[PDB]
Amino acid sequence: EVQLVESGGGLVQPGGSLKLSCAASGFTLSGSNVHWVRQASGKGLEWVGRIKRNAESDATAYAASMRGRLTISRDDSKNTAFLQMNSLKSDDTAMYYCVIRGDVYNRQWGQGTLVTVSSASPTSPKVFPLSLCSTQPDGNVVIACLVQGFFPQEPLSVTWSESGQGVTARNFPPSQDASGDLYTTSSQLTLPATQCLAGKSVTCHVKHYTNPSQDVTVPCPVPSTPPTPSPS
Amino acid sequence: DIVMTQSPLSLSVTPGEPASISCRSSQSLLRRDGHNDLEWYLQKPGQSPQPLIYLGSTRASGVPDRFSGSGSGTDFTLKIIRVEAEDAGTYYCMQNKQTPLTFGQGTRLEIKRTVAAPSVFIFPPSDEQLKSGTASVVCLLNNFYPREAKVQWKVDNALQSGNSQESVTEQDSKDSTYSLSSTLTLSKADYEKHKVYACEVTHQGLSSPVTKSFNRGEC
Amino acid sequence: LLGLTYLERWYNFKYDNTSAKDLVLYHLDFFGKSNSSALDNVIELGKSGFNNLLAKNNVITYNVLLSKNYGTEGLFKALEGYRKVFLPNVSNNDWFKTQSKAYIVEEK
Amino acid sequence: TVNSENGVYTSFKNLVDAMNINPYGTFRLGATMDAREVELSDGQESYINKEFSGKLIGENKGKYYAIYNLKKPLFKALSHATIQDLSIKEANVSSKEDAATIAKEAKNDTTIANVHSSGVIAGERSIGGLISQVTDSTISNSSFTGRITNTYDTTATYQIGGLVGKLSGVGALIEKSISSIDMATNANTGDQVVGGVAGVVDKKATIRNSYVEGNLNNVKPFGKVGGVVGNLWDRETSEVSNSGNLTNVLSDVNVTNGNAIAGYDFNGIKATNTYSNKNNKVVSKDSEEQRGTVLENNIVLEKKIELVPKKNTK
Amino acid sequence: KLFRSVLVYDAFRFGNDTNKETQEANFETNNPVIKNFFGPAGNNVVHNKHGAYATGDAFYYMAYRMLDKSGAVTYTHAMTHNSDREIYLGGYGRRSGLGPEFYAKGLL
């Protein structure tokens, strides 16, 4: 798309070799030397290194701690730049950013990439359709979607079935599980009583790193209590 | 090489208030194109900080008067003429010519809103998770300004720690009020040991903590 | 096989000696629409899917797919037409009472 | 028994070959067209699997012509492509994925005119009366007649409409088209949206002078279903600005378990004109059935848009 | 308004020739009754623990049995539940505070 397309990342075990290709489309990457500066999750940007432009001798230098396992290069012919990661470790998990510098013609901010370093395989989330068994709000119906036991934190798209006016769905940031490096998070929905009165059983859609959507069904709670007579 | 530093680190500012930040230079300001090395930045939710003023002495086109790029030479000057509810974030000054990209210490901005009382929407754990040997009690807090709050997972009025924690969203786009959610993680062996499960959240907006309890076997 | 099983199973009733099995499976032109094909009808009913072949939607399936092959408007209109052709001078309710095996008692 | 080279006027096989070899060009038909001449590959989903085709295709050559016996969607996607004076008299296209008579998608600035399709359409994941989903493009002077069925109970969302299923685009809209769809389906959850003229319109999508005639059926009323359009709530953040509008729309649909004009109402409804004649309009579950939601206007018969007879395809 | 049509069921708890044990049915038992009629007539009953409950447009016996006198008594109670807002009262609904059981056992 219209971004600094980085490929060859994603989940990867520690000690492996990861090859990153910061690709460009729509602008001249030759005139803007690509700089790679990684950032920890929620932390600031931490310098790594870069390779200069073709006219700038393609100088390659590496960070002191990271030196010895970087093969930083680029290919202006295919509008792409190379970042090579070797001997992966848990500290290497970061929000990696290839960026374009040294150019006034191109300074579009790249989206970067997410690299998580852990030998655990990606785990499909355990989608639990929690229902408001207790009393509902006076004018609204609240229905929540809960997912747990999913290892990779890269995009988790939780979307509901149908919404309109008066609906404000709230989703929470990922929370890492203390065991197995998994993650657990919930999703909240607000539903007007009129929509649920006619029916409109809501279904929860969740998206994983590569797993398809799990379309669990949540019957919206307006069931009239069965007036069962006690034995006489 | 050209070290960029920032003195302020975090601050709460109401909208329409002037805020000023200065970044200094430790080496030459020369760039690939010869302009000043500094490039201003502002953190935005759901993404990385975005550039504000690059080339140092040149104000970037399309940047409003709020952010001032009049800094030139070793010293620089950036202002925030008016604050917006969507301007919350951390501010970076950094050099972009040579190899060691040196970012500023960063000044996180939080928007000063009125204290609000969050609502409580508890959810009993699903029986499907109980079949997995684990449990999850969901205690929901919504649209409250003071993010600073403590959550106690008192299982049969006994607080447990190290397994159950909290999850708080960031400032909302509509009203810049945080929302809190906590989940009680208990094994099936511990689940059957305990009957009543309670969620306690101590919040400044809350006059007293609001707790909802579920008896084991409700679902 | 699936289409034939469905049609044979849900259409066992007989208008007098005439059997609706042979009258629904065969002679699709009983109302018009003489260009229809019985083999194509059964084949298409077989490939209509699990949702259509489901027993709970027999009237829905007749209204949506089986119709426009016999020229009918609805399932009940087709049954009324059959009752008007075979076995006349007997109200449809009386025919239903004499055809079903369930003990039906009506209290005026 | 002959083929044409300078312009593909003869056969559907040569037209498909020309589309594949030349996705970007001007084309014209000069004879009666049958789509069973070419063999449909099982793996193939559209008759033209290219990114775009029929850039300047048409049937304006003398008398207008028609294409017969369509077994799968005609095009894969549309990128500024223009189809003019197209006619389809027989259609049995169906696919478990997004199934449509002419194209699965139209990405930008595709103007479609004088296109009429006839036949029965089926599918599971989504069905478009003409196109399953369109972005930043418009279709005018069109019409579709036939039967639509997507009665599968799968929880996956399908945006299904008598002309277009999903219409997301600021510059995208449908104007002056006819929806004579004998549609029956199973709405199931509210995510699945059903529209007589358009399944769902978003990103300030306006509908002007379009009429729906055939019956709209969803057996269970839980889902969102509308006689003209299903709903206008934008998939993005909720504002009436991007919801879109309906103008000069008349529905004689015998819609079941759904409203005659709009399935889901708004506090501020952008629809300026709602027309509904004396039809089936009244189909603790209090709101499970419609009671003249936004249809209680123009109850008497109204003049129909006269664009139907000028297709003149025979 | 008394000429409406509302359906009632028995408990689906069929007895055996050997012991007085009315085992339930779940649309999957091998009893031919649910294989032939109750199955295809698609509607699930909640199978409450005890007490014949009304839905609002239908009814299902659960603990009683429709042939006995108690069947008739619970039938009157059930129709009082089902026909309360429209039939027994002159089109006016229930009193704003009183629940459905107020009109059921004490009176009517």
UniProtKB/TrEMBL annotation, chain E:
It comes from the Bacteria. This is LPXTG-motif cell wall anchor domain protein. It comes from Gemella haemolysans ATCC 10379. The chain holds residues 1748 to 1855 of 2178 of the full protein.
